[PDB]
Write an enzyme that holds these catalytic residues in place. Structure first.
Site, PDB file in Angstrom:
ATOM      1  N   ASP A   1       0.842  -1.187   0.000  1.00 16.17           N
ATOM      2  CA  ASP A   1       0.000   0.000   0.000  1.00 16.17           C
ATOM      3  C   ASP A   1       0.882   1.243   0.000  1.00 16.17           C
ATOM      4  OD1 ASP A   1      -2.812   1.200   0.363  1.00 16.17           O
ATOM      5  OD2 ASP A   1      -1.564   2.262   1.850  1.00 16.17           O
TER       6      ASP A   1
ATOM      7  N   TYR B   1       2.991  10.108   0.597  1.00 15.72           N
ATOM      8  CA  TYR B   1       3.923   9.535   1.569  1.00 15.72           C
ATOM      9  C   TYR B   1       5.379   9.868   1.247  1.00 15.72           C
ATOM     10  CZ  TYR B   1      -0.200   6.671   2.814  1.00 15.72           C
ATOM     11  OH  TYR B   1      -1.478   6.217   3.118  1.00 15.72           O
TER      12      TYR B   1
ATOM     13  N   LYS C   1      -2.552   5.980  -4.499  1.00 19.55           N
ATOM     14  CA  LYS C   1      -3.655   6.878  -4.208  1.00 19.55           C
ATOM     15  C   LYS C   1      -3.378   8.253  -4.803  1.00 19.55           C
ATOM     16  CE  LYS C   1      -3.826   4.559   0.320  1.00 19.55           C
ATOM     17  NZ  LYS C   1      -2.373   4.520   0.670  1.00 19.55           N
TER      18      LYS C   1
ATOM     19  N   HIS D   1      -7.615   9.318  -2.598  1.00 24.53           N
ATOM     20  CA  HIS D   1      -7.051   9.160  -1.250  1.00 24.53           C
ATOM     21  C   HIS D   1      -7.997   9.686  -0.168  1.00 24.53           C
ATOM     22  CE1 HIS D   1      -2.896   9.087   0.911  1.00 24.53           C
ATOM     23  NE2 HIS D   1      -3.863   8.736   1.749  1.00 24.53           N
TER      24      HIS D   1
HETATM   25  N1  LIG Z   1      -5.938   5.773   3.130  1.00 28.42           N
HETATM   26  C1  LIG Z   1      -5.533   6.522   4.157  1.00 28.42           C
HETATM   27  O1  LIG Z   1      -5.966   7.664   4.367  1.00 28.42           O
HETATM   28  C2  LIG Z   1      -4.521   5.934   5.094  1.00 28.42           C
HETATM   29  C3  LIG Z   1      -4.344   6.496   6.352  1.00 28.42           C
HETATM   30  C4  LIG Z   1      -3.521   5.877   7.276  1.00 28.42           C
HETATM   31  C5  LIG Z   1      -2.847   4.725   6.922  1.00 28.42           C
HETATM   32  N2  LIG Z   1      -2.978   4.237   5.669  1.00 28.42           N
HETATM   33  C6  LIG Z   1      -2.174   3.022   5.240  1.00 28.42           C
HETATM   34  O2  LIG Z   1      -2.278   2.048   6.253  1.00 28.42           O
HETATM   35  C7  LIG Z   1      -0.951   1.689   6.701  1.00 28.42           C
HETATM   36  C8  LIG Z   1      -0.976   1.204   8.125  1.00 28.42           C
HETATM   37  O3  LIG Z   1      -1.420   2.259   9.015  1.00 28.42           O
HETATM   38  P1  LIG Z   1      -0.404   3.123   9.903  1.00 28.42           P
HETATM   39  O4  LIG Z   1       0.915   3.240   9.239  1.00 28.42           O
HETATM   40  O5  LIG Z   1      -1.145   4.362  10.239  1.00 28.42           O
HETATM   41  O6  LIG Z   1      -0.235   2.311  11.275  1.00 28.42           O
HETATM   42  P2  LIG Z   1      -0.264   0.805  11.820  1.00 28.42           P
HETATM   43  O7  LIG Z   1       0.015  -0.143  10.719  1.00 28.42           O
HETATM   44  O8  LIG Z   1      -1.514   0.684  12.616  1.00 28.42           O
HETATM   45  O9  LIG Z   1       0.926   0.891  12.875  1.00 28.42           O
HETATM   46  C9  LIG Z   1       2.287   1.080  12.439  1.00 28.42           C
HETATM   47  C10 LIG Z   1       3.134   1.173  13.679  1.00 28.42           C
HETATM   48  O10 LIG Z   1       3.083  -0.088  14.386  1.00 28.42           O
HETATM   49  C11 LIG Z   1       4.395  -0.571  14.602  1.00 28.42           C
HETATM   50  N3  LIG Z   1       4.363  -2.024  14.510  1.00 28.42           N
HETATM   51  C12 LIG Z   1       4.189  -2.764  13.369  1.00 28.42           C
HETATM   52  N4  LIG Z   1       4.170  -4.058  13.568  1.00 28.42           N
HETATM   53  C13 LIG Z   1       4.338  -4.180  14.936  1.00 28.42           C
HETATM   54  C14 LIG Z   1       4.440  -5.302  15.767  1.00 28.42           C
HETATM   55  N5  LIG Z   1       4.370  -6.561  15.314  1.00 28.42           N
HETATM   56  N6  LIG Z   1       4.649  -5.086  17.081  1.00 28.42           N
HETATM   57  C15 LIG Z   1       4.737  -3.824  17.522  1.00 28.42           C
HETATM   58  N7  LIG Z   1       4.651  -2.684  16.831  1.00 28.42           N
HETATM   59  C16 LIG Z   1       4.459  -2.935  15.532  1.00 28.42           C
HETATM   60  C17 LIG Z   1       5.256   0.097  13.538  1.00 28.42           C
HETATM   61  O11 LIG Z   1       6.617   0.182  14.003  1.00 28.42           O
HETATM   62  P3  LIG Z   1       7.906  -0.068  13.073  1.00 28.42           P
HETATM   63  O12 LIG Z   1       7.561   0.379  11.671  1.00 28.42           O
HETATM   64  O13 LIG Z   1       8.972   0.765  13.754  1.00 28.42           O
HETATM   65  O14 LIG Z   1       8.200  -1.558  13.151  1.00 28.42           O
HETATM   66  C18 LIG Z   1       4.611   1.476  13.455  1.00 28.42           C
HETATM   67  O15 LIG Z   1       5.045   2.330  14.503  1.00 28.42           O
HETATM   68  C19 LIG Z   1      -0.152   2.948   6.418  1.00 28.42           C
HETATM   69  O16 LIG Z   1       1.254   2.757   6.476  1.00 28.42           O
HETATM   70  C20 LIG Z   1      -0.679   3.315   5.035  1.00 28.42           C
HETATM   71  O17 LIG Z   1      -0.092   2.438   4.083  1.00 28.42           O
HETATM   72  C21 LIG Z   1      -3.800   4.801   4.767  1.00 28.42           C
HETATM   73  O1  LIG Z   2      -3.723  10.305   4.701  1.00 27.18           O
HETATM   74  C1  LIG Z   2      -2.968   9.283   4.936  1.00 27.18           C
HETATM   75  O2  LIG Z   2      -2.863   8.283   4.220  1.00 27.18           O
HETATM   76  C2  LIG Z   2      -2.193   9.316   6.226  1.00 27.18           C
HETATM   77  O3  LIG Z   2      -2.066  10.621   6.781  1.00 27.18           O
HETATM   78  C3  LIG Z   2      -1.273  11.517   6.123  1.00 27.18           C
HETATM   79  C4  LIG Z   2      -0.152  11.135   5.413  1.00 27.18           C
HETATM   80  C5  LIG Z   2       0.634  12.131   4.891  1.00 27.18           C
HETATM   81  F1  LIG Z   2       1.738  11.759   4.191  1.00 27.18           F
HETATM   82  C6  LIG Z   2       0.368  13.469   5.053  1.00 27.18           C
HETATM   83  C7  LIG Z   2      -0.765  13.828   5.759  1.00 27.18           C
HETATM   84  C8  LIG Z   2      -1.618  12.861   6.286  1.00 27.18           C
HETATM   85  C9  LIG Z   2      -2.882  13.335   6.926  1.00 27.18           C
HETATM   86  O4  LIG Z   2      -2.906  14.316   7.666  1.00 27.18           O
HETATM   87  N1  LIG Z   2      -3.976  12.647   6.612  1.00 27.18           N
HETATM   88  C10 LIG Z   2      -5.284  13.019   7.117  1.00 27.18           C
HETATM   89  C11 LIG Z   2      -6.134  13.809   6.150  1.00 27.18           C
HETATM   90  C12 LIG Z   2      -5.724  14.127   4.861  1.00 27.18           C
HETATM   91  C13 LIG Z   2      -6.568  14.810   3.995  1.00 27.18           C
HETATM   92  C14 LIG Z   2      -7.838  15.188   4.402  1.00 27.18           C
HETATM   93  C15 LIG Z   2      -8.220  14.866   5.687  1.00 27.18           C
HETATM   94  N2  LIG Z   2      -9.555  15.238   6.149  1.00 27.18           N
HETATM   95  O5  LIG Z   2      -9.787  15.163   7.350  1.00 27.18           O
HETATM   96  O6  LIG Z   2     -10.378  15.611   5.323  1.00 27.18           O
HETATM   97  C16 LIG Z   2      -7.401  14.193   6.564  1.00 27.18           C
END
Ligand SMILES: NC(=O)c1ccc[n+]([C@@H]2O[C@H](COP(=O)([O-])OP(=O)(O)OC[C@H]3O[C@@H](n4cnc5c(N)ncnc54)[C@H](OP(=O)(O)O)[C@@H]3O)[C@@H](O)[C@H]2O)c1
Ligand SMILES: O=C(O)COc1cc(F)ccc1C(=O)NCc1cccc([N+](=O)[O-])c1
EC number: 1.1.1.21
Length: 316
Positions: free
Chosen positions: A44, A49, A78, A111
């Site tokens: 993803d 990012y 995205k 996104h």
């Molecule tokens: N569409 C959107 O708006 C949106 C928004 C948010 C996220 N996303 C996607 O979803 C992905 C995942 O969400 P996220 O990055 O917010 O957080 P997450 O996956 O909920 O948590 C990541 C964190 O958990 C830690 N971690 C991972 N595996 C672990 C384990 N086995 N034990 C302990 N800690 C662990 C990582 O540390 P380390 O990396 O240091 O190991 C990092 O600090 C994102 O990276 C992105 O690709 C999309």
């Molecule tokens: O949006 C993601 O995937 C994770 O969060 C971010 C990642 C980045 F690299 C930079 C910013 C964000 C972030 O603040 N994302 C949150 C966000 C974005 C756009 C609009 C809204 N909204 O509330 O409408 C919220």
């Protein structure tokens, strides 16, 4: 359980993927290489990012090494908010393709439903800190996404952070050509999303759960926020199953027919997080985890709360 879920475009999507938000550019190439070596087939990504070039180095090297074939990978990116305009969508997609070293994406998402003024800044602000909107609506952005399918740039299109009325707007679009394949939303035991998940699944849209571990590295974390990984109730379920808390948090959405995308740059955790296909949470475990909902969101911005398409005023 089975490793892939069937999408409404006829393609199969791996239910476990590697997240890359916050993965440092100097670490994410190795993270993705390790992930592919230990079985991940779904990554993803997003332009916002700022690390797609480095993700792409890893993908291209594993393809060159013949560790995997391109048709076995499922790469997601995205469209960022400053590119919702008809004339900018193709170039935004192409920049992502160039950076990732790919000639198509498996899935390309809007996104966020909020469009912002185009320009160099990812969050253009007025002098009082409100985001500056675009006047381009979600339906016209969707038509631009449909074009990408018809040009061969992407195999599937979808949405992210759309509330149910926004999903419904897409589904009710006059002249709709392709339904969204996926809605990628925040989902974990503190934000269980029953209503939105049921709606999307009832329409054949697959839901991907982001921040499944509660995003402990999110930049806006406060010491007093709840912590999934440290919740003794979740640790107890993990101990009963002889698994880690993270493994329980990843298996949970899988058993709800969701795709899940935990992020790590730690090689041991990348491997640990994949070892979730060999145990089952009971129905009682599932209902117990659901009971922890508190409507607590990682992702959502003060600067966007007056945008006409801000998604989180609606209940769901
Ligand atoms: N569409 C959107 O708006 C949106 C928004 C948010 C996220 N996303 C996607 O979803 C992905 C995942 O969400 P996220 O990055 O917010 O957080 P997450 O996956 O909920 O948590 C990541 C964190 O958990 C830690 N971690 C991972 N595996 C672990 C384990 N086995 N034990 C302990 N800690 C662990 C990582 O540390 P380390 O990396 O240091 O190991 C990092 O600090 C994102 O990276 C992105 O690709 C999309
Ligand atoms: O949006 C993601 O995937 C994770 O969060 C971010 C990642 C980045 F690299 C930079 C910013 C964000 C972030 O603040 N994302 C949150 C966000 C974005 C756009 C609009 C809204 N909204 O509330 O409408 C919220």
């Amino acid at each position: 359980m089975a490793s892939r879920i069937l999408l409404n475009n006829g393609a199969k999507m791996p239910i476990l993927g590697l997240g890359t938000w916050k993965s440092p550019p100097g670490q994410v190439t190795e993270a993705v290489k390790v992930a592919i070596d230990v079985g991940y087939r779904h990554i993803d990504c997003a332009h916002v990012y700022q690390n797609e070039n480095e993700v792409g180095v890893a993908i291209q090297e594993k393809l060159r090494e013949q560790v995997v074939k391109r048709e076995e990978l499922f790469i997601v990116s995205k469209l960022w908010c400053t590119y919702h305009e008809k004339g900018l969508v193709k170039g935004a997609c192409q920049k992502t393709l160039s950076d990732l070293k790919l000639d198509y994406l498996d899935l390309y998402l809007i996104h966020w439903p909020t469009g912002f003024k185009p320009g160099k800044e990812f969050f253009p602000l007025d002098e009082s800190g409100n985001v500056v909107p675009s006047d381009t609506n979600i339906l016209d952005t969707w038509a631009a996404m449909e074009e990408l399918v018809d040009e061969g740039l992407v195999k599937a299109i979808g949405i992210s952070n759309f509330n149910h009325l926004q999903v419904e707007m897409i589904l009710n679009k006059p002249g709709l050509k392709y339904k969204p394949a996926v809605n990628q939303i925040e989902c974990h035991p503190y934000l269980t999303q029953e209503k939105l998940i049921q709606y999307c699944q009832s329409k054949g849209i697959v839901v991907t759960a982001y921040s499944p571990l509660g995003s402990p590295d999110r930049p806006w974390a406060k010491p007093e926020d709840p912590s999934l990984l440290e919740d003794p109730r979740i640790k107890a379920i993990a101990a009963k199953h002889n698994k880690t808390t993270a493994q329980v948090l990843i298996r949970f959405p899988m058993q709800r027919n969701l795709v899940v995308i935990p992020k790590s740059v730690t090689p041991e955790r990348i491997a640990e997080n994949f070892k979730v296909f060999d145990f089952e949470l009971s129905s009682q475990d599932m209902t117990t985890l659901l009971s922890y909902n508190r409507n607590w969101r990682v992702c959502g911005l003060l600067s966007c709360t007056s945008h006409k398409d801000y998604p989180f005023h609606e209940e769901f």
